[PDB]
Amino acid sequence: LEAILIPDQGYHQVGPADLCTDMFVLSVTVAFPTKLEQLVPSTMKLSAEGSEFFFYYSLLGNDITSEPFHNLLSPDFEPERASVRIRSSKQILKAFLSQQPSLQIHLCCGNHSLGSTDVSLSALAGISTDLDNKAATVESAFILQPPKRVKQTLPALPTDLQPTLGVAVTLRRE
């Protein structure tokens, strides 16, 4: 199963076009970054202003970049939503989402990743038990991790203040 973009119609076909004809909307919201400064080592001194950061992920092969921000201590980040339209059948779409790799969201500087988190799209498929009547949403604050630590250190506990990003993934009929 693959999501084929129909450029003139602005949706992605999942399944046979003559059998799978229902319209769905898959939305990703990113919001409320916290403690992003902890993704940068304390021995790396950034100048007060002049840096530009943003968030990136890929949604069904579509590149999604947030508005830029310049202060890791206070991103002042307005919540941002991206949505893709999908023409499929309820059962085919769930199977497709169950086979997808995790949604990977990066804190970026240029083309460098300062940290990333994974959001399970197969978990969204599992809770999509009532799409005829209610949209299904996977939502939480997800922990951001830097790309490469040199040595193993004592892991942070889930109760600890770590870099996090609010991520909500919602699936519904159109």
Residue numbers in the entry: 168 to 341
Please give sentences taken from the publication describing this entry.
Using X-ray crystallography, we show that the ciliopathy-associated centriolar protein CEP120 contains three C2 domains. CEP120, for example, plays a key role in the duplication, elongation, and maturation of centrioles, which in principle could impact the production of a functional basal body (Comartin et al., 2013, Lin et al., 2013, Mahjoub et al., 2010, Wu et al., 2014). All three C2 domains of CEP120 (C2A, C2B, and C2C) adopt the PLC δ1-like topology II and are structurally similar to each other (root-mean-square deviation [RMSD], 2.4–2.6 Å), with major differences found mainly in their loop length. Thus, the CEP120 C2 domains probably play a role as protein-protein interaction modules.
For the O.n.-A200P mutant (equivalent to the H.s.-A199P JATD mutation), we obtained diffraction-quality crystals that allowed a successful structure determination to a resolution of 2.1 Å. To obtain this crystal form, we introduced an additional mutation (G307S) that we found serendipitously. The CEP120 C2B (H.s.-A199P) mutant structure revealed an overall preservation of the C2 domain fold and only subtle structural changes. In the WT structure, the O.n. A200 residue is located at the end of β strand 1 and its side chain points inward toward the hydrophobic interior of the domain. The replacement of this alanine by proline causes a change in the main-chain dihedral angles of the preceding residues, resulting in a local structural change. In the mutant structure, the loss of this hydrogen bond is compensated by a peptide bond flip, allowing the main-chain carbonyl O of O.n.-Ala198 (H.s.-Ala197) to form a new hydrogen bond with O.n.-Gly333 (H.s.-Gly333). The most significant conformational change is observed for O.n.-F244 (H.s.-F243), the side chain of which moves to avoid a steric clash with the bulky pyrrolidine ring of the proline. Other structural differences between the WT and A200P mutant, in particular the conformational change in loop 1 and loop 3, are most likely caused by different crystal-packing interactions.
